Design a protein around this ligand. Structure first.
Ligand SMILES: CCCCCCCCCCCCCCCCCC(=O)OC[C@H](CO[C@@H]1O[C@H](CO[C@H]2O[C@H](CO)[C@H](O)[C@H](O)[C@H]2O)[C@H](O)[C@H](O)[C@H]1O)OC(=O)CCCCCCCCCCCCCCCCC
Ligand SMILES: CCCCCCCCCCCCCCCCCC(=O)OC[C@H](CO[C@@H]1O[C@H](CO[C@H]2O[C@H](CO)[C@H](O)[C@H](O)[C@H]2O)[C@H](O)[C@H](O)[C@H]1O)OC(=O)CCCCCCCCCCCCCCCCC
Ligand code: CLA
Ligand code: CLA
Ligand code: CLA
Ligand code: CLA
Ligand SMILES: CCCCCCCCCCCCCCCC(=O)OC[C@H](COP(=O)(O)OC[C@@H](O)CO)OC(=O)CCCCCCCCCCCCCCC
Ligand SMILES: CC1=C(/C=C/C(C)=C/C=C/C(C)=C/C=C/C=C(C)/C=C/C=C(C)/C=C/C2=C(C)CCCC2(C)C)C(C)(C)CCC1
Ligand SMILES: CC1=C(/C=C/C(C)=C/C=C/C(C)=C/C=C/C=C(C)/C=C/C=C(C)/C=C/C2=C(C)CCCC2(C)C)C(C)(C)CCC1
Ligand SMILES: CC1=C(/C=C/C(C)=C/C=C/C(C)=C/C=C/C=C(C)/C=C/C=C(C)/C=C/C2=C(C)CCCC2(C)C)C(C)(C)CCC1
Ligand SMILES: CC1=C(/C=C/C(C)=C/C=C/C(C)=C/C=C/C=C(C)/C=C/C=C(C)/C=C/C2=C(C)CCCC2(C)C)C(C)(C)CCC1
Ligand SMILES: CCCCCCCCCCCCO[C@@H]1O[C@H](CO)[C@@H](O[C@H]2O[C@H](CO)[C@@H](O)[C@H](O)[C@H]2O)[C@H](O)[C@H]1O
Ligand SMILES: [Cl-]
Ligand SMILES: [Cl-]
Ligand SMILES: [Fe+2]
Ligand SMILES: [Mg+2]
Lengths: 37, 36, 341, 62, 334, 81, 451, 27, 36
């Protein structure tokens, strides 16, 4: 468990480790918006 | 013709696929077929 | 300008998906075989034919869904929707395995429609028909495995069911019952498939690494133009490379590309011939000379003898649940087991 | 303090969300940029001051 | 020039009928050592106690095998991962009993086949080619490392390496499925897609090029004489082939860039075989294929069997029967 | 180049998304309701999780008779009550 | 836009990071931002792991891989690996997660806002890849940094609480290391050991004094080599041996990382000293040995004479000899007789497993440990069903050792592939044929035919 | 709770791109 | 066995030293284009 004061950020903590994977995907979004030049 | 940018269409459609497959992976652990 | 010629004009119009006369056969049959498979794996059980759940609706996943074969008691019945078994009841037809024959028969006629499409398009554009000829191999495989194999056997029940894990069961059934890995026709198939993937890998890699510098970019795909007359890669350098690495090399590009047709196509044909034998249980199950020796000399052991014991385990441990029409009751004391496990 | 901790932590969550969006949109818009460096300098130092606030108030709340 | 400079020029000479090179000075002795030992072992080696249980398996032709059943049997389970060269044995007869030839062959082979990869880099460099044929070869190479070395390491014994024979290969495969459910592992499934697709693409590319060959010959001669070695002109009409295959499927499904097409032919079976090799090499650490045994349960709690449950019965039959005298305790742990 | 309108012109147009922001959810919702009303079970004959077995049954309702298979299933279903 | 399309830069979008080869400011931003990703994951994963962490279950039953690293460093654990204080795990996660914002800010700054190249801004920070003396200087700075990092592990072990010692007398416990092994015949003796069975190369390190003393040697070697590379330029034999380019230095690192990845895979699979079994679960060898022990204990309790029981083959059912005469457990676990573990070593004598100690001196804590390890073998399915492939669903278990070994084999392999890709390309690009054969001077046409 | 955090995080990336697309940013 | 061990050690060392010194012997300059 987190220290009990932090217990409302548990839904945020549950999704924090996947955030790096979204950076990989974000490079494809940015390249789509410039049209892969 | 060229209203909505194709990158926006691609991104929302790409994310729609992720959500649907992610639901199917969620259903592997809940309900029918979960072994529970 | 009769009605035939105007219909021929429309069927052969340049469009996004070419239709053709073959498309009259191909497009409904392919759509139904594809759609029947998705329908059955989404919504249809195998509870009454196999005692299995086989649909997403019952809790299976993509690896475990299948459109399963009909019950063994159906024999080789066509299982038409209007036939004497379903009697026009769609719900019962799905329960009796009528979707299996539906997919198999429409898949068969679609595959014909696809090879007819290959001939028709090759004739219209003016190329030779080698792609259709190469497609004879997947057709030969489909016909031998999905039709001739169950026709030789007791019923359609023993055909492969159209599902991922169901196919895996078919693979392990053929080991345990047919010793199919020992069959020289399967071995020729393996060589054609693996030799085909090797040629695919090596030819692709050889072309990509003997390319001429035809432009300034470090990404080299832009330096190709389809209207060029010149070879895009150096056959001479490729030949010298492979002759020095491996001893032999291609020196004729036409023979190279034919050999690439020939290898996987011959392999698949060879495996089809093996499966036709297995339709009649004409297996390469055993080597008689080793069995004579192993029977009389309890110290003679080989990898072949070990595999036969594995096969005996497969048959005994799988048959009661894999063949529920037989009503096998194999008491625990009759099941072959080694020590401890 | 009790309510001061999570409120300042929910401030740090909120402000990080304005910094995660607002910093690359302001670094990649070099036109009206002199007006954006101040909000970057402010938000950076405000963010660092909230980490220290959450870090100090953790040891009255845990 | 001194003798060393002359020797180096011979070694790296592009005029040698077979290229030696620096990788070749390792590859050649190692591969000759592995070949000679393999051939002698396959013909003539006495039975080998593979399972460490004093139950020797006959692998050679002279001891009763044919081409199909014969093998070089893996080294003894009692040896484990221990290095067993000839000098560690008290005699050749003991080395033979314990499966010494297997360790000698696979070690020389893997060292030799690694240098074959390096040698492919080396010659491409000497010839001015691009360097990545060796990357393609790293797929079957990794596969060989997987079955001969990585699998034994994770399992703790060279007795679990794939035997050097045809039926021995099948035994390795069946036991592997029993213990790891390899068919239900997505890396193996990608391997299958790699090899079926590779054979498919091999057939497709062969057939489309052959279909679009430009007429240079008559009916009474092989069309292959229409191509001359080192001719500058293209021997097939890639626009015709694209025009066929883009009407067979649809236009944007078909390659019109030959460079893209050939890259795809490289990348598809290579990436697929890499996944296959990683499959074996990760099942070496007993991360197994998907287990859906009893995944489907009714409202009461009755197990409803699926096709995965039928696979498990077959898996059980191999498992209870394999190495039938080697197990003393209820769980097969390595 | 076969004369059809390009796909990237269609799916970037607003008229497409006027239409398909209605037709795509309606199809998805129609599929959702085919399951959640239970119609999928009655069209296909797939067992619900409480209709595989009778309450004390352990045996499988396997079809054993070719020309009376339609009746064997109906007798198996009438034993579910 | 500078070098941000294929026509200007020569590289397509999918080779887009190769446009940064000579843009040192944007390239610095790529690296700092990526370091932020690593630090983010370390932080975010730890907090995820801690939010899920049940203190009353073992860590290896919980799918944790970072919390065991922290526990091994001495934080949060009492005797036998039990968790006494979750708060050090919270700190390690938080401080990583906050520092990732700082690295992310500086990565994004240099990637998008700052100068594209550094060579005009600063002579110290700018570099040419072809500048061999500058390259060794940056290498030397980074060696000194890594050498201090190794000494930090020594600092924790010796002066800041110690490390978890699974081999400590009386059970595993956090122990300050007072006498690290400084003697180079021991430290560099591990480098010369065979990697094969019974030997294990550096993977067989089995005491924290050798671990700590090695890190003293590595920290001082890395600082000395750091200073050496700041003060020297690559000698003549080194300049003629290597390719001196950005892609070439990347390839050399990829070769190094692949080798290290393969070594870590073996470390986590076999070593129970720096990967304590109380945190990571039993090793593959450990569980198989634990099974033989469990059934030895049960059968001896029933009255069996375990040293004289024949198995089906004639070898001893519970006990047999290794190929060098040591008394070892029988059955298939004969392959794992070189396993050493703190629960098993009290039964070992001079000749291996002592039969009198086995009859009389197995404690209940060893019986519990053997049963626990036998039932937590690193065998499980990809959907985390524990046990063999034939097992039913019930147990949700895949050992951290399996997760860590499999992942790092996969990564080490592709990094080997990357090494081969980049080493071949850097060779070709330096010699000038990476874009293809020049049609006018095709090299093979100037060669004599082979036959 | 978990589904709304991943939604707000999952839109922040595309919003950066969309906001620089509308201000003619240095993409 | 000892004589065989020494013979293999010598032979293996010989070929390894050929490989290492041979790659040290100006290997990047053995190419058809830039003989620097
Ligand atoms: C080419 C490329 C293009 C491919 C074309 C695409 C596919 C086209 C469509 C194919 C559909 C084929 C369906 C054939 C069904 C079949 O056969 O159905 C089988 C029936 C015979 O019925 C079977 O008959 C058996 C024998 O019974 C007999 O014996 C019993 C025991 O004594 C009883 O006496 C019984 O009353 C008596 O009839 C059992 O009863 C089986 O259950 C029952 O299924 O034959 C019949 O319909 C017809 C038999 C004669 C025609 C056979 C030609 C086709 C088969 C070729 C393959 C031969 C395979 C040999 C394997 C090698
Ligand atoms: C460039 C130069 C490199 C190439 C030049 C040629 C180099 C030759 C290297 C020889 C490596 C032989 C492979 C055997 C590795 C092995 O048995 O590995 C295992 C060993 C560890 O060995 C084990 O180590 C154990 C140590 O544990 C002991 O100590 C522990 C202390 O905690 C515990 O107490 C434990 O219980 C106790 O038993 C025991 O000794 C075991 O018996 C022993 O088996 O790892 C090791 O030494 C660590 C290194 C293993 C590397 C893994 C290689 C992977 C390569 C993949 C290549 C893919 C290629 C693709 C091509 C395309
Ligand atoms: C770890 C992953 C990683 C990193 C750090 C980079 C970094 C970089 N890439 Mg590369 N790239 C990557 C993966 C990565 N890339 C992948 C996976 C692909 C394939 C799609 C590419 C394909 C590619 C191409 C084709 C190009 C680059 C280019 C670049 C450089 C400049 C980008 C730019 O200015 O555009 C501007 C983009 C924006 C302004 C959009 C805003 C995006 C921001 C940065 C996101 C940050 C959000 C984050 C949550 C906020 C943190 C703030 C907080 C810490 C305060 C930059 C150094 C370019 C280059 O090399 O030019 C010389 C270039 O042309 N990349
Ligand atoms: C690999 C790491 C790295 C490197 C080599 C650089 C290099 C550079 N930075 Mg960048 N930067 C970085 C990371 C890095 N930075 C990070 C993490 C941030 C966010 C804080 C920034 C934010 C930043 C800004 C806003 C600016 C620079 C600038 C510069 C240039 C001049 C810096 C200088 O002379 O200060 C002299 C350095 C010192 C007096 C000492 C450094 C101060 C810190 C506090 C010491 C920390 C050292 C310690 C070992 C760190 C351990 C980190 C570890 C845990 C990861 C130089 C090219 C300037 C520039 O771009 O000019 C145009 C500039 O304006 N950087
Ligand atoms: C990241 C770490 C790192 C890197 C990249 C470098 C890189 C370099 N070093 Mg430096 N060095 C380092 C750390 C490092 N060093 C440290 C920590 C020290 C102090 C120990 C030194 C002390 C040092 C000296 C004294 C010299 C270098 C030199 C060099 C240059 C050439 C090296 C070479 O040819 O390698 C390849 C090595 C060889 C060809 C030697 C034979 C290697 C055999 C064939 C393989 C043996 C290992 C094998 C895999 C077995 C491993 C296990 C084994 C222990 C049992 C190169 C720039 C040379 C230079 O030019 O400096 C100016 C040089 O003279 N370094
Ligand atoms: C430190 C490690 C490292 C670094 C700095 C580089 C750097 C580079 N590589 Mg190399 N590479 C590496 C490791 C590395 N590589 C490894 C390990 C391999 C073997 C796989 C390669 C194989 C490789 C090839 C084949 C090529 C490069 C190329 C390049 C250049 C451009 C890269 C780019 O823009 O990609 C942009 C990024 C993408 C297009 C996305 C890639 C996505 C991958 C394939 C899947 C992602 C993995 C993920 C876990 C799975 C999906 C998860 C899902 C949930 C989304 C750049 C110099 C190119 C080059 O040679 O330039 C000269 C090139 O053609 N690299
Ligand atoms: C990453 C894996 C690497 C992909 C390439 C592997 C094939 C090697 C075949 C033998 C060499 C064949 C050969 O020589 O290739 C050469 C070919 C073209 O070479 P060029 O020199 O034109 O470009 C490569 C570099 O020079 C950069 O410009 O290389 C490329 O196409 C690289 C593509 C990288 C594309 C980015 C990586 C993403 C692809 C992988 C995604 C896979 C999805 C998997 C899902 C399961
Ligand atoms: C049988 C029958 C019929 C028919 C029907 C039909 C025709 C159907 C169709 C149907 C269909 C037509 C369906 C569809 C379905 C689909 C689906 C269900 C899909 C799915 C998808 C997904 C899931 C995705 C995924 C993926 C992949 C695949 C790959 C890539 C990646 C991803 C992930 C994206 C009739 C009435 C005539 C008659 C009687 C019988
Ligand atoms: C350049 C580039 C790129 C990249 C990017 C990157 C790589 C970045 C990074 C970034 C980063 C790396 C970032 C970071 C961030 C962080 C953050 C933002 C933090 C936060 C923190 C906080 C706020 C927390 C809180 C808390 C606490 C304190 C306690 C516990 C609880 C919690 C968790 C709540 C790309 C590819 C896209 C493309 C283009 C270019
Ligand atoms: C910490 C520790 C320790 C220690 C350790 C040590 C002390 C280490 C060292 C290490 C080292 C001391 C390493 C080294 C490495 C090396 C390498 C890995 C090498 C490489 C090389 C190469 C790469 C080369 C190449 C080449 C050739 C061959 C020819 C010519 C060209 C070239 C140059 C390219 C111990 C175990 C006690 C315990 C645990 C912890
Ligand atoms: C720690 C923390 C934080 C931070 C966070 C962050 C750092 C974020 C990031 C985020 C991001 C970084 C995101 C991103 C996203 C992305 C996405 C969403 C993408 C997607 C994609 C897709 C879907 C794709 C598609 C496509 C295209 C585009 C083209 C080609 C094709 C395809 C279809 C593939 C905050 C502030 C909250 C506070 C609390 C704590
Ligand atoms: C593994 C144990 C050995 C470790 C070796 C590390 C020692 C470091 C210094 C070794 C010196 C290598 O130095 C290298 O020697 C060779 C042969 O003598 C030199 O001489 C070479 O000249 C040219 C290329 O330059 C070649 O065509 C020629 O065949 C060769 O004689 C190289 O130009 C020099 O770079
Ligand atoms: Cl066996
Ligand atoms: Cl056992
Ligand atoms: Fe070709
Ligand atoms: Mg479910």
């Amino acid at each position: 468990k987190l220290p009990e004061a932090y217990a409302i950020f548990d839904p945020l903590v549950d999704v924090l480790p996947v955030i790096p994977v979204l950076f990989l995907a974000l490079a494809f979004v940015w390249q789509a918006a410039v049209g892969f030049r | 013709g060229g209203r909505i940018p194709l990158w926006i269409v691609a991104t929302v459609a790409g994310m729609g696929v992720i959500v649907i497959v992610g639901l199917f992976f969620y259903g592997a652990y809940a309900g029918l077929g979960s072994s529970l | 300008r009769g009605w035939f010629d105007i219909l021929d004009d429309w069927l052969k119009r340049d469009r996004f998906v070419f239709v053709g006369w073959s498309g009259i056969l191909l497009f409904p049959c392919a759509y139904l075989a594809l759609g029947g498979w998705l329908t059955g794996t989404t919504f249809v059980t195998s509870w009454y034919t196999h005692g299995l759940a086989s649909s997403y609706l019952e809790g299976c996943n993509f690896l475990t869904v299948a459109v399963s074969t009909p019950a063994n008691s159906m024999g080789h019945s066509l299982l038409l929707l209007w036939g004497p078994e379903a009697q026009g009841d769609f719900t019962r037809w799905c329960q009796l395995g009528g979707l299996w024959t539906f997919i198999a028969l429409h898949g068969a006629f679609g595959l014909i429609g696809f090879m007819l499409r290959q001939f028709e398009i090759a004739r219209l554009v003016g190329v030779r028909p080698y792609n259709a000829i190469a497609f004879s191999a997947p057709i030969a495989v489909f016909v031998s495995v999905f039709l001739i194999y169950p026709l030789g056997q007791s019923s359609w029940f023993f055909a492969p069911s159209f599902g991922v894990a169901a196919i895996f069961r078919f693979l392990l059934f053929f080991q345990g019952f047919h010793n199919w890995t020992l069959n020289p026709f399967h071995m020729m198939g393996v060589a054609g498939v693996l030799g085909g993937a090797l040629l695919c890998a090596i030819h692709g890699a050889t072309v990509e690494n003997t390319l001429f510098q035809d432009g300034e970019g470090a990404s080299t795909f832009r330096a190709f133009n389809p209207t060029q007359a010149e070879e895009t890669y150096s056959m001479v350098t490729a030949n010298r490379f492979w002759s020095q690495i491996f001893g032999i090399a291609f020196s004729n590009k036409r023979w190279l590309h034919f050999f690439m047709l020939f290898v996987p196509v011959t392999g698949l044909w060879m495996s089809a011939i093996g499966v036709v034998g297995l339709a009649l249980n004409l297996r390469s199950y055993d080597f008689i000379s080793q069995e004579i020796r192993a029977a009389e000399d309890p110290e003679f052991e080989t990898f072949y003898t070990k595999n036969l014991l594995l096969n005996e385990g497969i048959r005994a441990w799988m048959a009661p649940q894999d063949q529920p029409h037989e009503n096998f009751v194999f008491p625990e004391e009759v099941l072959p087991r080694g020590n401890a496990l | 303090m009790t309510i001061l901790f999570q409120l300042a932590l929910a401030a740090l969550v909120i402000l990080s969300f304005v910094m995660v969006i607002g910093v690359p949109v302001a670094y990649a818009s070099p036109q009206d940029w002199d007006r954006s460096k101040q909000l970057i300098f402010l938000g950076s130092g405000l963010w660092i001051a909230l980490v220290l606030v959450v870090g100090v108030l953790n040891f009255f709340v845990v | 020039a001194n003798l060393w400079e002359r020797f180096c020029n011979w070694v790296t000479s592009t005029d040698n009928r077979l290229y030696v090179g620096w990788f070749g000075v390792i590859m050649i002795p190692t591969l000759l050592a592995a070949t000679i030992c393999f051939v002698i072992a396959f013909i003539a080696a006495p039975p080998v106690d593979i399972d460490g249980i004093r139950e020797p398996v006959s692998g050679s032709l002279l001891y009763g095998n044919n081409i199909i059943t014969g093998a070089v049997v893996p080294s003894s389970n009692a040896i484990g991962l221990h290095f067993y060269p000839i000098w560690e044995a008290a005699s050749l007869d003991e080395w033979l009993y314990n499966g010494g030839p297997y360790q000698l062959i696979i070690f020389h082979f893997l060292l030799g086949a690694s240098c074959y990869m390096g040698r492919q880099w080396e010659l491409s460099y000497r010839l001015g080619m691009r360097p990545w044929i060796c990357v393609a070869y790293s797929a079957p190479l990794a596969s060989a490392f997987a079955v001969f070395l990585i699998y034994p390491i994770g399992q703790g014994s060279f007795s679990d390496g794939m035997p050097l024979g045809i039926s021995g290969t099948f035994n390795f495969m069946i036991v592997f499925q029993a213990e790891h459910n390899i068919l239900m592992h997505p890396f193996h499934q990608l391997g299958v897609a790699g090899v079926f697709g590779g054979a498919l693409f091999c057939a497709m590319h062969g057939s489309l090029v052959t279909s679009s060959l430009i007429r240079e010959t008559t009916e009474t001669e092989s069309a292959n004489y229409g191509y001359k070695f080192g001719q500058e002109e293209e021997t097939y009409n890639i626009v015709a082939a694209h025009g066929y295959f883009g009407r067979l499927i649809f236009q944007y499904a078909s390659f019109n860039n030959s460079r893209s097409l050939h890259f795809f032919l490289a990348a598809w079976p290579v990436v697929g075989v890499w996944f296959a090799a990683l499959g074996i090499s990760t099942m070496a650490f007993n991360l197994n294929g998907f287990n859906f045994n009893h995944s489907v349960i009714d409202a009461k709690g009755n197990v409803i069997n699926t096709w995965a449950d039928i696979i498990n019965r077959a898996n059980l039959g191999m498992e209870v029967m394999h190495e039938r005298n080697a197990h003393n305790f209820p769980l097969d742990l390595a | 180049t076969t004369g059809e309108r390009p796909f990237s012109d269609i799916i970037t147009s607003v008229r497409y998304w006027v239409i398909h922001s209605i037709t795509i959810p309606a199809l998805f919702i129609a599929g959702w309701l085919f399951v959640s009303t239970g119609l999928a079970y009655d069209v296909f004959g797939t067992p619900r999780p409480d209709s595989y077995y009778a309450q004390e049954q352990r045996s499988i309702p396997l079809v054993t008779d070719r020309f009376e298979a339609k009746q064997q299933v109906e007798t198996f279903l009438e034993q579910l009550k | 836009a500078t070098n941000r399309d294929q026509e200007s830069s020569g590289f397509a979008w999918w080779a887009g990071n190769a446009r940064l080869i000579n843009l040192s400011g944007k390239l610095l931003g790529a690296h700092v931002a990526h370091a932020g990703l690593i630090v983010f994951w370390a932080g975010a994963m730890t907090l995820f792991e801690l939010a899920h962490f049940i203190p009353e279950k073992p860590m290896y039953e919980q799918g944790l891989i970072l919390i065991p690293h922290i526990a091994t460093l001495g934080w949060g654990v009492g005797p036998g690996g039990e968790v006494v204080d979750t708060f050090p795990f919270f700190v390690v996660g938080v401080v990583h997660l906050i520092s990732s914002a700082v690295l992310g800010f500086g990565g994004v700054y240099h990637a998008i806002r700052g100068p594209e190249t550094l060579e005009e801004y600063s002579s110290f920070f700018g570099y040419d890849w072809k500048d061999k003396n500058k390259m060794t200087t940056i290498l030397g700075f980074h060696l000194i940094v890594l050498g201090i990092g190794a000494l930090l592990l020594v600092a924790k072990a010796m002066f800041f609480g110690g490390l978890y010692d699974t081999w400590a007398p009386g059970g595993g416990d956090v122990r300050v290391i007072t006498n690290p092994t400084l003697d180079p015949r021991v430290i560099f003796g591990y480098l010369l050991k065979s990697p094969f069975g019974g030997e294990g190369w550096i993977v067989s390190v089995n005491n924290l004094e050798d671990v700590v003393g090695g890190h003293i040697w590595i920290g001082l070697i890395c600082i000395a080599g750091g200073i050496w590379h700041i003060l020297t330029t690559p000698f003549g034999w080194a300049r003629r041996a290597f390719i001196w380019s950005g892609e070439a230095y990347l390839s050399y690192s990829l070769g190094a990382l692949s080798m290290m990845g393969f070594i870590a895979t073996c470390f986590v699979w076999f070593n129970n000293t720096v990967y304590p079994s109380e945190f990571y679960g039993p090793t593959g060898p450990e569980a198989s040995q634990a099974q033989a022990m469990t059934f030895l204990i049960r059968d001896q309790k029933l009255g069996a004479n375990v040293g004289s029981a024949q198995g089906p083959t004639g070898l001893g059912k519970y006990l047999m000899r290794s190929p060098t005469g040591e008394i070892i457990f029988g059955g298939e676990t004969m392959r794992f007789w070189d396993f050493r573990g703190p629960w098993l070593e009290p039964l070992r004598g001079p000749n291996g497993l002592d039969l009198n100690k086995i009859k009389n001196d197995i404690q209940p804590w060893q019986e519990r440990r053997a049963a626990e390890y036998m039932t937590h073998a690193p065998l499980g399915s990809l959907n985390s069903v524990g046990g063999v492939a034939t097992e039913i669903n019930s147990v949700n278990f895949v050992s951290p050792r399996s997760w860590l070994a499999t992942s790092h084999f996969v990564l080490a392999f592709f990094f080997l592939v990357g090494h081969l890709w980049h080493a071949g390309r850097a060779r070709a690009a330096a010699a000038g044929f990476e874009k293809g054969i020049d049609r006018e001077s095709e090299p093979v046409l100037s060669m004599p035919s082979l036959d | 709770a978990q589904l709304t955090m991943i939604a707000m995080i999952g839109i922040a990336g595309p919003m950066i791109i969309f906001l620089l697309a509308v201000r003619r940013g240095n993409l | 066995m000892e004589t065989l061990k020494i013979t293999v050690y010598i032979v293996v060392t010989f070929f390894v030293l050929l490989f290492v010194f041979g790659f040290l012997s100006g290997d990047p300059a053995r190419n058809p284009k830039r003989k620097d």
